[PDB]
Structures are given as structure tokens and as C-alpha cells.
Design a protein around this ligand. Structure first.
Ligand SMILES: O=C(O)c1cc2cc(Br)ccc2o1
Length: 274
């Protein structure tokens, strides 16, 4: 057990998710992130194929763990008297998509296309593993800059995927759908698709489309940057007011705007300077 295994570096960030530090696994010098979550702030608990009582976040991370690099991997976890500590993979060099978009502004469509396509593969992976993320947004996406690979992180608001209605939510309100805002009800997939329309708008315009409940519920989309008609059509489709008018992941990926994606490595070479 215990913390002779890791060397702790700088605080990377803190918020509604807790406090995350940069670290290094002593035994092999592997870069990691060490995330601390307070017990008092965990409202959702689960249990392991084992039967230990742990944060749902740990259950969800283990369900999605794999060599598939589009979703962050949980390497280990520790319990403390008042907290859990999660050891997560850390790409180096790395930048979150929110910071990238702060620096670069609106992304060229070729680049948004490659990023959005990888996010779609990542989210399909979560859903295949029985996990609904419920907080897809640029702050929860890391870019592995040498490889041009995106990783979904932060499963602290997520849930087991089910086919019936959700009536709780604690992810990001500006990425939440109209049906959550009006009725406090949503189904997991069509709510995920709505957050993906907000994300894709964020990438191609450089900020999210809606800031207020009234705008979310109206669902009228205004493009403040020049954006191709095929891209605008995909976005307006993801942002359909009625959940069942939203595309499936397969319909998103077969959309004409999604064709001819760059490989991740080509993406880093052309856009991230490799
Ligand atoms: O909340 C998380 O899952 C999280 C934050 C984070 C930051 C880095 Br860097 C790497 C992995 C990470 O995972």
C-alpha cells in the first residue's frame, strides 16, 4: 500500500471534481495525475465486482479501462479516512481542449472534424462499456499533443447507462438539454448527443452557443463565425429540441461533414506542430 509509490508534483487544477496533481510513479517514472476526491462530496456510491463501497466514479472508470486510448485510464486508487485518491494516466505534453480553444480561437473545420470524430469514438466506448459520462465538454477532454489523440476524462458526474429516464443530473448546465432544463427528465443517449452539438459548436465558433436557460429551451442557433453549411446542419441536428429528432452516433458519423477524417498522427503533424 501507500505513498512511497508516487512523487507528487504541481497542483494542476481543482473544482467541483476535487484537486488534481501532476505526479510520477516512482517505480518506472510513468507520468500520472493524482486526483483527490472528498468523501463528503461524493453523493453517488457504488460497489465493485468485489463488494467494497467506492465512489461511482471509480466503478465507471474501471468499466471503461482498456488500452483504447480515447478514454482516460484509472491505474490505481486508494482509500483514506476522508477521501479517495485516484491515480490516472497523464499524457505529456498535454493540454485540455478548453485551454487549446482559449489559445487558438475557433478551430479550422478539418481540425474540429478530427477532434469531434475522436470524441464520438470515445463516447461510443463509454456507452459500449455500460457508462454514461453526462459531462462531455471541452474542459473534460485532454489532447495528447505528440500523438494528436484526445482522451475523455472526469467521470465524477457519470452513471451506469440505462434505457429508462434519468431524473438527477450534476454535470454542466450550459451543456445540458432543454428537457432537463424544463422537466428535470432526460434519456442518456439523446442528452449525450445534445452535449456533443454544444461541443462541436464550441470548437467551430470558439465559445458555446447558449449561456442562459432561456436560450437552451428556445434552441435557436446563431453562428457567430463562418461555418460550412454541412457543419451547421450537423450541429442544428444534434441540437434538435425534441430528443427523438437528434441523430444517433451512427447518423452523426455517417454525416457528410464527418467524411475523410484525418488520422490522429496526421492531425498532430498538420495542426499541433509535430
Ligand atoms: O478527473 C479526471 O478524470 C482527470 C483529470 C485529469 C488531468 C490529467 Br493531466 C490527466 C488525467 C486526468 O483525469
Amino acid at each position: 500500500p501507500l505513498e512511497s509509490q508516487y512523487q507528487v508534483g504541481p497542483l494542476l487544477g481543482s473544482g467541483g471534481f476535487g484537486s488534481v496533481y501532476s505526479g510520477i510513479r516512482v517505480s518506472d517514472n510513468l507520468p500520472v495525475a493524482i486526483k483527490h476526491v472528498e468523501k463528503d462530496r461524493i453523493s453517488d456510491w457504488g460497489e465493485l465486482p468485489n463488494g467494497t463501497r467506492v465512489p461511482m466514479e471509480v466503478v465507471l472508470l474501471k468499466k471503461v479501462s482498456s488500452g483504447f486510448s480515447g478514454v482516460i485510464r484509472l491505474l490505481d486508487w486508494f482509500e483514506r479516512p476522508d477521501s479517495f485518491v485516484l491515480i490516472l494516466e497523464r499524457p505529456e505534453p498535454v493540454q485540455d481542449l478548453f485551454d487549446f480553444i482559449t489559445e487558438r480561437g475557433a478551430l479550422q473545420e478539418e481540425l474540429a472534424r478530427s477532434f469531434f470524430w475522436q470524441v464520438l469514438e470515445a463516447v461510443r466506448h463509454c456507452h459500449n462499456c455500460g457508462v454514461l459520462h453526462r459531462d462531455i465538454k471541452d474542459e473534460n477532454i485532454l489532447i495528447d499533443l505528440n500523438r494528436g489523440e484526445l482522451k475523455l476524462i472526469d467521470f465524477g458526474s457519470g452513471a451506469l447507462l440505462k434505457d429508462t429516464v434519468y431524473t438527477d443530473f450534476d454535470g454542466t448546465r450550459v451543456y445540458s438539454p432543454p428537457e432537463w432544463i424544463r422537466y428535470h427528465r432526460y434519456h442518456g443517449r439523446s442528452a449525450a448527443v445534445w452535449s456533443l452539438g454544444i461541443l462541436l459548436y464550441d470548437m467551430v465558433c470558439g465559445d458555446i452557443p447558449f449561456e442562459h436557460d432561456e436560450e437552451i429551451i428556445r434552441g435557436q442557433v446563431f453562428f457567430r463565425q463562418r461555418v460550412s453549411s454541412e457543419c451547421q446542419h450537423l450541429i442544428r441536428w444534434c441540437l434538435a429540441l425534441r430528443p427523438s429528432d437528434r441523430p444517433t452516433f451512427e447518423e452523426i458519423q455517417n454525416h457528410p461533414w464527418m467524411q475523410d477524417v484525418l488520422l490522429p498522427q496526421e492531425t498532430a503533424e498538420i495542426h499541433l506542430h509535430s
